[PDB]
Symmetry: D2
Subunit: 295 residues, 4 copies
């Protein structure tokens, strides 16, 4: 036997940071969950108990806090690039750093219609994420995403025209509920290193904003032919609005809402145009995925 691949590090490192404007007194908070996995010349830790090649995961954790203390933690694309670059430059034998960041929402509260200087609400469980891969001699690969964005439209979704054979029982519909949890990923052109990542810093928050905005508008306004058709329209538009992105990926569950036939009860009409009350189904769920790039 032989080691064919190996990576190790620290997962589920919770990190909070506050910025305090000494002038205005306005404070701002950031909270993330960070994972850093390293690869490089570490096989001997596995095959011969050689721990000299191991940067202890506890030191990785300390390094995450130290880097957050010494650098901006926003946008997460930048912070993860700084953190992965640190490990491949500090440690001669570490050749790749894989950094995942989950950003948690802390939205400033409005009290009496005015923004509060230091009080915040988790207005939703939606996350903003990055996957930053810093590879020696291969630059910096960033995938940005939003996830846990849960939406529903009560009409203006259709699904008809699908294959029908002896395994098919689904009825065609011209009017149904569509609900999903949006997982949207935009993959950035390769960056040569930290200077290039820094040089594009504004595009990270802009592009996240755009992806979110396009996702919500397209969802709301598309008279959807299918989840497949609607997500492609989302991906297309994002691609057309930020040239530094190479691909857009969607992963969307179809969170089904079933009609309930109550006709058995005093002739009640609750189906088709008369449908008012529905049974949300926890499982199973369709799962629809696509990666869209440039023609």
């Amino acid at each position: 036997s032989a080691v064919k691949a190996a990576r190790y590090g620290k997962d589920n490192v919770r990190v909070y940071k506050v910025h305090k404007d000494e002038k205005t007194g306005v404070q701002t908070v950031y909270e993330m969950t960070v994972c850093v996995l390293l690869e490089g010349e570490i096989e001997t830790s596995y095959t011969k108990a050689d721990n000299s090649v191991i940067v202890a995961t506890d030191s990785i954790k300390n390094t995450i806090y130290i880097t957050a203390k010494q650098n901006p933690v926003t946008p997460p694309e930048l912070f993860g690039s700084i953190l992965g670059t640190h490990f491949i430059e500090k440690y001669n034998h570490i050749h790749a750093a894989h950094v995942n960041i989950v950003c948690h929402r802390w939205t400033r509260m409005d009290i009496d219609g005015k923004p509060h200087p230091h009080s915040f609400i988790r207005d939703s469980e939606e996350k903003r994420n990055v996957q930053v891969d810093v590879v020696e001699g291969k630059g910096i690969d960033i995938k940005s995403s939003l996830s846990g964005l849960t939406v529903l439209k009560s009409t203006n979704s259709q699904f008809w025209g699908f294959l029908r054979d002896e395994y098919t029982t689904l009825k065609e519909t011209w009017d149904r509920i569509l609900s999903t949890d949006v997982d949207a990923t935009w993959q950035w052109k390769n960056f040569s290193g930290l200077q290039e990542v820094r040089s594009h810093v504004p595009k990270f928050d802009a592009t996240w904003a755009t992806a979110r905005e396009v996702t919500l508008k397209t969802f709301a306004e598309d008279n959807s032919a299918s989840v497949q058709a609607t997500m492609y329209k989302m991906a297309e538009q994002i691609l057309a609005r930020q040239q530094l992105i190479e691909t857009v990926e969607y992963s969307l569950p179809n969170k089904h809402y079933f009609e309930i036939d109550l006709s058995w009860h005093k002739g009640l009409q609750n189906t088709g145009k008369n449908a008012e009350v529905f049974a949300p189904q926890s499982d199973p769920n369709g799962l629809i995925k696509c990666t869209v790039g440039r023609s």
Copy 2:
């Protein structure tokens, strides 16, 4: 042996309802999770396999959908009162109905600054709940709550002056992070039946709004002496703004955020007035509770 208490029913009934304005075309959605437990002359089901006294839980489920079809599902206080009253009036031997409702958020989206007629976002995992107990000959007891309201303030929380003995290591602080998940419950004066519950329908949404508003404002503006001191101020105010409430209960975890001493690293200053980066602690957590009533 003897049966000393017994209740049974259907739990985790997911229910969606849509309202469609035929005029404006504006649609509105409601989604809840409903539990209905019955008590009454049912002991023989337990002691002698007498299932004649059992309203099957499947029929309870059908009844929930049927009642949602035939009645408003909002405010949840009303819907749960209608549902519990149904069981104690329909079934001579059923003498109490315990109804719990969890209302899920489906907030109308704004697209291009204007409200969409049929698209919605789960803007947060915060819930609005009711516990409605309909008891034959004892009226209707309603407890309303909000839960999962997650908040943080980065300053203007203190904790000093607490008991110190040989078990104490906590340092007094004059400036700390305070974060919690708000579980707030207001308990309504007894209602004689469904007519009285209906007669006060507007107060249910008003009072939920108030509790939420008071919770957030007090949290944001109180230079907090403790979680205990701050929650009492919240409870007091709600009591003073709605006379039909008899008590207000809070259950608040103290979700600790620990300073991180980095002085061991190149003399870095990250404590006290220099604290920027903190470690959010998943567990353990203080848990602070109180029930406040009228003097």
Copy 3:
């Protein structure tokens, strides 16, 4: 307004303890999650920012570790009694201590058919729990339970004879799947204090063993008429086997497994006596509860 009730403390305190036999070299591990809530003369912390009456939750946490260091942590009934007694005796103004313990499974592994001296497996997520209430001048009230015990029988469950009216669609059945998650609670006669709790220490592990044994055997062998009928038989038997118990409570979900009609597909027979493949339903679920005492 006035404080009507108040309690506070530390929740979700994870605790591990190891015992090392210096002789045999056999080690044994215990792992729990502990919550301690205190009540007493603490209202002023809420109404006037008087933190002098507060035993900080951090000190409560230290006290849990200190007590586990100085005392056996098993059986949990004993450990929780020692811990609650500590707070009401140490602090003149603390008059009640509410202690909840969740015991996690660490079962010794058998390697090559022989018990290993220091390696363990979480053989299941089933828990053993206690709720110990130590109240000044009111002794010690203990409720013991097992929970998360997940079981299924594929036959020898029936449900017929239940009420049928216009809300009923459930078909009677003489052969169905029954699956549940057992939550079983035995409530001990009041104990005058720690000496009496100690005097009965053997009965705690014995009685837990019995409840589990009776639960599983009755479940397996009862040709069940209903969940109601089967759980009562369990409760009865436990009551008859340990006289120091006053009541036995069960809370049992009916985790439904639905038949799937495939007759629409090449005449396939999958219902009634031909049922092989079923759809386990995550929600909703019947919920059946009872408390049985002595006639």
Copy 4:
């Protein structure tokens, strides 16, 4: 823009199956959660609302139940191969089927020391899984795994000799707790189709048994130098015991258990050789991974 990749299907399909021996009366149950994702000539569903190419996810679900009715569901390697082969052979334009199966434990109960014919316990949340990829013209690729196998040893784990620099605070240790959740994956040599998968059916249960057995024994008996060193020994051995496996992957969290210094309390000794009580840490956690193949 252009579709670069696309797959869709049904996720979280719960499936139960019972086998009933008409002779002995012994019944046996199987329960899984199945996901089937298809790829092929489906891009037009995304780009032009062409649903003709879509096998509805609801039909995929029906097909899962139908296949479970018509075929053995065990070993899961076989069942997933049958299911993926069905889709690529039935549908000319579907060219790959990705099938994931999670098998849930239903272990036969022993009542009074004898195996019960139809009653079962979820003895643990550990799962047995398969990932079966059926690709037209590329055979069948199977990855088998076990996951959620939670273990702890109280001694005979060490960690010393790791890199130390200005970011390091971890103390070397010669005696620590090691606990993890085992995720172990063995990847099978490519299979040409269903006949070859069938021809090796016995090796699937045998090899799962072996991997589990090796995992537990190595964990228990290795005086571990690191998680890295111990997992490699596990992977090596499995590779040496089943030649049809090409690689073995482990993903292991280091679920830390921290010593608690109580020396501040009456000089209590709870560290090093005196350590009895520890604080299990929920997060963060080291994460150690490796893929081992043949030299």
